[PDB]
Design a binder for this molecule. Structure first.
Ligand SMILES: Nc1ncnc2c1ncn2[C@@H]1O[C@H](COP(=O)(O)OP(=O)(O)O)[C@@H](O)[C@H]1O
Ligand SMILES: Nc1ncnc2c1ncn2[C@@H]1O[C@H](COP(=O)(O)OP(=O)(O)O)[C@@H](O)[C@H]1O
Ligand code: BEF
Ligand code: BEF
Ligand SMILES: [Mg+2]
Ligand SMILES: [Mg+2]
Lengths: 645, 645
């Protein structure tokens, strides 16, 4: 649904800068209006209070455009008189979007006077003094809990003259206490306005004279992973294609000989072939395992499915971007059907049909009619492996040839031909072509988030949430590949695309330490290359923080670590490190969940409270919070952390 | 906003117990439908998934009634085919409400099996084993984080036959890990159904032969605080009237003299009058300061405005309930216009007009027209003193005679005669008659909430929230007293009444130690009497926990405590105790905010991290968690804590 103006902040004209709020619609009008996308209300002033169904924040008009933050508004339309107003500008790199100001809105005039005394207008219509520190930073004169600033994203920072310097996007905190603010400067709005609104990256980049990074954006099934590298090779170039998917990589190996007359090298855990062809497909993981870029090996490196924000992909792409030019590559291509800021749009091959409550098979609050999957080939996405197992069993019991597939199973369990219903997690979301007549989508997924909970340190949490627009379009894209297909779904919405959580950064340091022999400093170099590259998914810059954390986790127990690596569960390094600290203290793990099995053999010798370093799951045992490592991580958390408001 | 049926949990009819969900609406309807009260959807099943605009939980049909928890639904109507359906049952004491089961719904059979293996059905249609421990208690077979049980209140506990043993209401936790469940047994549903539809409490209870506690409920301005005690006195009884309000208590003296020919004793912190009359008006605070009930002093003790859930009232009423019989009182009267579960109904004397955006004075997102308050006598409620000061300054200003009244100002600031606009906090919400032609209500208020945040211990947090139904009716009732009046408001809504937070219990122990020379054990006895008395506001039973915490806080610095008491801020005992710990540790306080001003004299000598005991506001300083008191309080949090789901 649409973002909706629900009120305004009225700014003083004369003298000291003051503000007050006017509210213009309640909840009922908000929702109704969010749907029709038709808002008949007269808009006034320059600072609007805007609301989605779930969140509320600000928007500031400058130069005839109503500006706000991407992290708040996504790519959403703004409700307007004639109906929904699509964003004119969507700049994910700058966390900035804009709609053409509706009639009645007035614009603030840009501040061009280099005044460093600033005033931030909050959603509560407070005006708080801020000292400008940099192009996009200013310190607060009196610090405040972040909770106070929450909902003031999009609000103006003003000069003493009432001219706008930029809009508020983020707080810089010390353990939950905001001490500085980060803003999108008015000049970024200016740059945006004199740049193309349309960027059709649908053609393969030309191979440049000197090193360049370029983007390739075209719909699922169009040929990005197959036709494009084959055409580069046919022109005499050596090409490495990196994909996050084992299943897809193996698929290219079987497909490319007959499809494009090229029998590529293949590099994965279960299958490494050297044919000597000028095309190589590898996973990001295997690429990392082999040590990254080899000097002079490739002309073109394709970072394929670069919408993937699993830690292996992030670290893999950062490695390419840090090493490619030195390694003699002429071109890095960042290829994806669903770039940051994209929304799901109609696919020419794909008919979409909502599930209803009618059907024999209960599916995420709706139902699947048995006749929809009785014959033919179908892929059904479930959010968890457990649901996959359960659904597969149910269907099998109904005489349907069903097979579950997810992380830790072998690709071979999927039959390549004949009738089948594959019930999968996002292990099959990206890259893969399984010849499916249809996809059925639960529209939910699992995600991890870090919370700086100070209890004593941080928490990594797992929750199931609505899918974003990358997931919806990629899951949908598993059908309609070279032919017609069907997409059935439970719910119609999607979260905005192109953002990922700080926990993934934590995951990258972990993997660098556990699997790829990278010092934390080495990982930072690779991740910094990723973050410095425009057009990729974005994340809060917590590199210094995470580096400091892992840098202090020295002398892990090699035995426990090999075990956590072997069992293949999340944060093998953080888990083995907590276990290490436990063992050396003869103390029990936080709980006796499966997470802590590397410790089971010591169970009768472990007593008293757990020296808790951080929280990776439920903690059932008593804890003590004064282990030297705990104190070190607490100290790490004293550094500035930028968090969104 | 009505409660809305958004789906159902379908249960199996034979064999092992299984469940699955069907979803019948999104925010389409839900938020819409809750705001319109109309739901044409046909109801099926015995377990409904229900929702308000803000929260989602369950309802279970038993004996033709759709039951759920008061803490989730309040007194809300259920959206129905022909409009909102009024609750048939409202049992705040048991946390239980019910609507007549809509057509199409089936009921579960009450369980008589006497089985101790139960199964709890969650909102995600999970079915989880529970061993019955008591009448309303059961242990989980495997503990889960409490977050998992959230949104499942109102859900059924089933015995193996699928018959209902009761509905889920709260989790018993150990550091956030649920290990048992508290439920409302079907027999309570049985008792609730057999209890009178309506009990009339509008007439003064007769004085019984043996001690009795009785209720008196009647509209604002009906005479509960004046006519009633005057009538009892005419019958020859000695009557103590305890009222929360300093302002109202002082007002009774002159008025009772002129209207009722009684010159009452008056007891407040700021002023005492002893006339020897058979009627005494006292604040709850002065009553506690006086040592509570004096042997054989009164026949009748009226706990007036017993809707009040400030800590002083709760401790005051608890003291009465524990002491009155032994002190030789024959009757205790719990009097209020707004008992737990009540909602605001129209008042014969009061015309209600919503504020619009039209007017010269900005007010909480709306506007006040100058002509509505110029002139005559008017009372405007703001949520904070700062807002009262700002608005009073603005009104005068425009040449309006305005004064702010809040705690810390002398009652004499309010002119008893002539034009005035009094801008007040809830210092003037209950009891008071100020001869106002109107009340203008911001409809918000300030509340405190405890969070068991384990960082390292607990947090007391202050937030601004929508007013409850007690606040609406009580604030409104400041006008229309013996004559017509006008109530102007910012927003239509009201939160449910009759519940208060655990932090109030914390405040009670704090006040006991700080002001009334009560040991924590002493305070527990008084609070236990409050909690055991039906018909009063309800709270989670955290008495043992809080008592354990304060019992450990020994050897407070007398001078610090004297200072925090004198400054009048929120938790003088806890603040002075943290200050004591800091000064002895030669360490700085959590911040240099005004809360910690008692330490300023020592500032130059204090360095290093704060030995943090708990969180009462922002913590700016680095912290250490090594202090023995910190560890004592951590150990206290290991106790069972029941929290709602
Ligand atoms: N393993 C495979 N088996 C059969 N057909 C395939 C396979 N891989 C690709 N194709 C065909 O090649 C087309 C292009 O696929 P691909 O290059 O993977 O698309 P993109 O990367 O653009 O999503 C697909 O639509 C499908 O028609
Ligand atoms: N201090 C006062 N000054 C003037 N009139 C008063 C005062 N107190 C009470 N009254 C009158 O007595 C009536 C009953 O007041 P009160 O007993 O305070 O009502 P209740 O306690 O039921 O709200 C009021 O409506 C008003 O007419
Ligand atoms: F865009 Be394709 F599905 F990789
Ligand atoms: F009910 Be009255 F206003 F005390
Ligand atoms: Mg591809
Ligand atoms: Mg009264």
């Amino acid at each position: 649904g649409s973002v909706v103006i629900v009120g305004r902040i009225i700014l003083s004209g004369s003298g000291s800068i003051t503000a007050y709020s006017q509210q213009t619609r309640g909840l009922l009008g908000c929702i109704i209006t969010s749907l029709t996308g038709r808002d008949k209300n007269q808009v006034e002033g320059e600072v609007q209070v805007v609301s989605t169904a779930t969140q509320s924040f600000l928007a500031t008009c400058v130069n005839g455009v109503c500006w706000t933050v991407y992290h708040g508004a996504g790519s959403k339309t703004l409700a307007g008189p004639k109906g929904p107003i699509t964003q004119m500008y969507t700049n994910v790199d700058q966390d900035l979007v804009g709609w053409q100001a509706p009639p009645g809105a007035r614009s603030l005039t840009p501040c061009t006077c280099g005044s460093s005394d600033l005033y931030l207008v909050t959603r509560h219509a407070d005006v708080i003094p801020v000292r400008r520190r940099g192009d996009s930073r200013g310190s607060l004169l009196s610090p405040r809990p972040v909770s106070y600033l929450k909902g003031s994203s999009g609000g103006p920072l003003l000069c003493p003259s009432g001219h706008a310097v930029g809009i508020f996007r983020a707080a810089v905190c010390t353990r939950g206490v905001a001490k500085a603010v980060d803003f999108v400067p008015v000049e970024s709005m200016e740059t945006t306005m004199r740049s193309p609104v349309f960027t059709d990256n649908s053609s393969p980049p030309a191979v440049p004279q000197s090193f360049q990074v370029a983007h390739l954006h075209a719909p699922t099934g169009s040929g990005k992973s197959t036709k494009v590298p084959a055409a580069y090779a046919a022109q005499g170039y050596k090409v490495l294609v990196l994909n996050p998917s084992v299943a897809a990589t193996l698929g290219f190996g079987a497909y490319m000989s007959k499809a494009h007359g090229i029998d590529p090298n293949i590099r994965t855990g279960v299958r490494t072939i050297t044919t000597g062809a000028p095309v190589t497909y590898s996973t990001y993981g295997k690429f990392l395992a082999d040590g990254g870029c080899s000097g002079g090996a490739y002309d073109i490196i394709i970072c394929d499915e670069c919408h993937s924000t699993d830690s292996t992909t992030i670290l893999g792409i950062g490695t390419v971007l840090d090493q490619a030019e030195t390694a003699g590559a002429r071109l890095v291509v960042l290829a994806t059907a669903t770039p940051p800021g994209s929304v799901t749009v109609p696919h020419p091959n794909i008919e979409e049909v909502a599930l209803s409550n009618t059907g024999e098979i209960p599916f995420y609050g709706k139902a699947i009619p048995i006749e929809a999957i009785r014959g033919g080939r179908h892929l059904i996405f479930c959010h968890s492996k457990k649901k996959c197992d359960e659904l597969a069993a149910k269907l099998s019991g109904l005489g349907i040839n069903a097979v579950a597939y997810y992380r830790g199973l072998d690709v071979s369990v999927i039959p390549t031909i004949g009738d089948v219903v594959v019930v999968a997690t996002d292990a099959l979301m990206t890259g893969y072509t399984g010849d499916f007549d249809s996809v059925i989508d639960c529209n939910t997924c699992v995600t991890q988030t870090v919370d700086f909970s100070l209890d004593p340190t941080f928490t990594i949490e797992t929750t199931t949430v609505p899918q974003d627009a990358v997931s919806r379009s990629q899951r949908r894209g598993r059908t309609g590949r070279g032919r017609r297909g069907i997409y059935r779904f439970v719910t119609p919405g999607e979260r905005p695309s192109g953002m990922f959580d700080s926990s993934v950064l934590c995951e990258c340091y972990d993997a660098g330490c556990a699997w790829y022999e990278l010092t934390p400093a080495e990982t930072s170099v690779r991740l910094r290359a990723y973050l410095n590259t425009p057009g990729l998914p974005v994340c809060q810059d917590h590199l210094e923080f995470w580096e400091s954390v892992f840098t202090g986790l020295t002398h892990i127990d090699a035995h426990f670590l090999s075990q956590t690596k072997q069992a293949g569960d999340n944060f093998p390094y953080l888990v083995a490190y907590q276990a290490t600290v436990c063992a050396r203290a003869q103390a029990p793990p936080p709980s006796w969940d499966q997470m802590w099995k590397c410790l089971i053999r010591l169970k009768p010798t472990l007593h008293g409270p757990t020296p808790l370093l951080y929280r990776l799951g439920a903690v059932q045992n008593e804890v003590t919070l004064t282990h030297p490592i705990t104190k070190y991580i607490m100290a790490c958390m004293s550094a500035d952390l930028e968090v969104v408001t």
